[PDB]
Design an enzyme around this catalytic site. Sequence first.
Site, PDB file in Angstrom:
ATOM      1  N   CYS A   1       3.441   0.646   8.967  1.00  0.00           N
ATOM      2  CA  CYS A   1       3.486  -0.224   7.799  1.00  0.00           C
ATOM      3  C   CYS A   1       4.882  -0.289   7.175  1.00  0.00           C
ATOM      4  O   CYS A   1       5.513   0.739   6.927  1.00  0.00           O
ATOM      5  CB  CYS A   1       2.454   0.228   6.768  1.00  0.00           C
ATOM      6  SG  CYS A   1       0.758  -0.177   7.242  1.00  0.00           S
TER       7      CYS A   1
ATOM      8  N   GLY B   1       1.114   4.081  10.014  1.00  0.00           N
ATOM      9  CA  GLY B   1       2.437   4.676  10.028  1.00  0.00           C
ATOM     10  C   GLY B   1       3.505   3.691  10.462  1.00  0.00           C
ATOM     11  O   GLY B   1       4.691   4.023  10.483  1.00  0.00           O
TER      12      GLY B   1
ATOM     13  N   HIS C   1       0.789  -1.234   0.000  1.00  0.00           N
ATOM     14  CA  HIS C   1       0.000   0.000   0.000  1.00  0.00           C
ATOM     15  C   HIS C   1       0.824   1.289   0.000  1.00  0.00           C
ATOM     16  O   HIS C   1       0.261   2.381  -0.103  1.00  0.00           O
ATOM     17  CB  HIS C   1      -1.054   0.016   1.119  1.00  0.00           C
ATOM     18  CG  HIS C   1      -0.481  -0.082   2.496  1.00  0.00           C
ATOM     19  ND1 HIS C   1      -0.345  -1.282   3.162  1.00  0.00           N
ATOM     20  CD2 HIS C   1      -0.020   0.872   3.341  1.00  0.00           C
ATOM     21  CE1 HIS C   1       0.178  -1.064   4.356  1.00  0.00           C
ATOM     22  NE2 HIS C   1       0.386   0.234   4.488  1.00  0.00           N
TER      23      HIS C   1
ATOM     24  N   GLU D   1       0.805  -8.743  -0.672  1.00  0.00           N
ATOM     25  CA  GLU D   1       0.873  -7.424  -0.043  1.00  0.00           C
ATOM     26  C   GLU D   1       2.313  -6.957   0.157  1.00  0.00           C
ATOM     27  O   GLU D   1       2.620  -6.207   1.087  1.00  0.00           O
ATOM     28  CB  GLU D   1       0.111  -7.417   1.285  1.00  0.00           C
ATOM     29  CG  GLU D   1      -0.155  -6.032   1.854  1.00  0.00           C
ATOM     30  CD  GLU D   1      -0.937  -5.142   0.903  1.00  0.00           C
ATOM     31  OE1 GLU D   1      -1.700  -5.673   0.068  1.00  0.00           O
ATOM     32  OE2 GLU D   1      -0.788  -3.905   1.000  1.00  0.00           O
TER      33      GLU D   1
END
Length: 179
Positions: free
Chosen positions: A144, A142, A37, A68
């Site tokens: 991630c 934050g 992301h 992911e």
Amino acid sequence: LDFALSLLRRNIRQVQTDQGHFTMLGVRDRLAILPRHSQPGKTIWVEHKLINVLDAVELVDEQGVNLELTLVTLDTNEKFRDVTKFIPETITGASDATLIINTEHMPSMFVPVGDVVQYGFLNLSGKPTHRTMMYNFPTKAGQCGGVVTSVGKIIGIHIGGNGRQGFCAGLKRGYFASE
């Protein structure tokens, strides 16, 4: 600890994309890994340095399922200390993991997230994901890209959370094979 610090200092970087702040593990040579992301564009900022992104591979499994994770090759001379030897062949949980976060907002931080369990399927924001693991720790945004380590092992990359639980993408050594 003795391993986490070395890892932090030599392989984990503060990064920004158009999507915000992220932690980035450089694995070897010019190859780094990012949470999907973060959506790296043609360039990224690594510690405020603007860097061309030479290749960005969104990792998928055999069933074509989203993992992911995004593999980026970076346009820099300096190579990363090769840490593939600390990454397990097979996706593995742990009893006392540490989440290493390193962004501009959360600099050089270790989070004792406790036990990391095999979780498997996960519906991250609507999109299905595979090979996830879980830890019982209020994870925040934050964080991630944060790196989940054990005693000498790098086992995952934080990809999200549901408030009460943090979620990571499991790491296999095979993701980082040359070509």
